[PDB]
Amino acid sequence: MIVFTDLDGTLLDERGELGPAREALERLRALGVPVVPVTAKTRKEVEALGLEPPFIVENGGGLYLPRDWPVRAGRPKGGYRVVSLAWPYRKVRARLREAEALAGRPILGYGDLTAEAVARLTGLSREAARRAKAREYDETLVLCPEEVEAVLEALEAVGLEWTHGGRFYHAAKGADKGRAVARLRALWPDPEEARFAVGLGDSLNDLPLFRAVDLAVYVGRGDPPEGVLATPAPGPEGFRYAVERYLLPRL
Amino acid sequence: MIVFTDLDGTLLDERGELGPAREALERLRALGVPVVPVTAKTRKEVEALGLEPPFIVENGGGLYLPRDWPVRAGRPKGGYRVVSLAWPYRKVRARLREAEALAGRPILGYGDLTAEAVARLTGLSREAARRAKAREYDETLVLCPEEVEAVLEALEAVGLEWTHGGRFYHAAKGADKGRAVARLRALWPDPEEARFAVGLGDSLNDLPLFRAVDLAVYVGRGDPPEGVLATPAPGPEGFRYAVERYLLPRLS
Ligand SMILES: O=C(O)[C@@H](CO)O[C@H]1O[C@H](CO)[C@@H](O)[C@H](O)[C@@H]1O
Ligand SMILES: O=C(O)[C@@H](CO)O[C@H]1O[C@H](CO)[C@@H](O)[C@H](O)[C@@H]1O
Ligand SMILES: [Mg+2]
């Protein structure tokens, strides 16, 4: 069993972990169940949250492995090997400039904003905002609710893809959580451990993650998508719930 | 006679250059008629244009005088004395956060943007954008057309004042081109010289300028403000026309 989790509102929601979630996390760790973060966040953000690879960043744009992973894949980088699945940020930013021309209006994202601006808009600290700005693949957009559609059509017109992360639209090419999960499972050292994958997500828009695992659990508010399990409560209690009810009785 | 003039859309051409206005300005100088820029631009932008004090920056937020101005006012800063009329930028920026909470959506200004983004948004060079970001009083807002109504009401709700410079909305408190021109006229070393004021402008933020002068001339696009003089063509050609048709005859 491998457990894939969107940080977002599955594990984090309230900033970082939280009582019930921690307890559930330790439980998994004690049982030798690998837990793999799958997040919109950057590698700099995940590191600051003290997480060790493997993890999936920027909506599936990048798969980070320990440098000594038993399966040779990706490019060596310090204590990591990085599997790049998506176009680099600089290329995404260049295409965004083409999109603006098409939409005949400015398209702003984190690349255009100061860290203090990003911090204000996200509720992050300036320090965490700086890490959220350190993007390798995916751009977080700041769009006027009223102009979202014109912008999205322009993005696709220039070959970019878009997703919604919970509060912001994102632009990238090749970044998909399901693709990244399938890739990491195919790169797993022990094929039997990766045979059964669980995916926990806090977004009605985590379908790519939900599609790529064998047991999908939606830990948010309201009804889950079709073919996806639910929990009574959202947040860390929803994560703990799902862990205690769906997982522990399998190990 | 003192001629008070906006820069963007008035004395500057569409690309921000003084070239086209030079001949008209040279007529005024020869005739010994003072010309005072009254602009949305910052001090650093006015300096980069090679303009000398006195001048009024940031929609009337600050009055810049020569260090040796005969009438003592404001505070020293090397070659300048500065009369601050409006709240400092830091206070406007903090108040904008309350406006943003009230609107329930982001309200972005230059202060939130890199020089590179400001350059892209304005068509300025990166270097000119750094100068435009060096704001002391007034914030330039970057609003999508659909959110303007809600944004301007949120500004008013939190005690900020708004205006528009021809291309962008602005937020400040106490920054008013008419207030600043009136203050400058009162600080003028030659009351007879200051007795008759002319004001040229093209945008919303210039209506207060028009009200603070004795002869107002609109060189913007479309129809002029009620009872204000108009010119055949906008911008610097409008400025030149005004000098030749409206000002010269009066100087004789
Ligand atoms: O799209 C969002 O709503 C969130 C969560 O999905 O991701 C963005 O926003 C987060 C802050 O809320 C950042 O930490 C991420 O890097 C990213 O910029
Ligand atoms: O509001 C505008 O239309 C213009 C008019 O001067 O001013 C803003 O925009 C100008 C760039 O177009 C900057 O030079 C100014 O500092 C200010 O940010
Ligand atoms: Mg103007």
Automatic annotation (TrEMBL), chain B:
Top-rank taxon: Bacteria
Pfam family, one: Hydrolase_3
Enzyme Commission designation: 3.1.3.70
Gene3D superfamilies for the chain: HAD superfamily/HAD-like (3.40.50.1000), Putative mannosyl-3-phosphoglycerate phosphatase, domain 2 (3.30.980.20)
Cellular component terms (Gene Ontology): cytosol
GO biological process: mannosylglycerate biosynthetic process
Gene Ontology MF terms: magnesium ion binding; mannosyl-3-phosphoglycerate phosphatase activity
Swiss-Prot/TrEMBL keywords: Hydrolase, Magnesium, Metal-binding
Binding annotation for Mg(2+) 1: D6, D8, G165, D202, S203
Enzyme class, first EC level, given as a word: hydrolase
Coiled coil: none
NCBIfam families assigned to the protein according to its UniProt record, in alphabetical order: HAD-SF-IIB, HAD-SF-IIB-MPGP, osmo_MPG_phos
Protein name per the record: Mannosyl-3-phosphoglycerate phosphatase
Originating species: Thermus thermophilus (strain ATCC BAA-163 / DSM 7039 / HB27)
Lineage, broadest ranks: Bacteria, Thermotogati, Deinococcota, Deinococci, Thermales
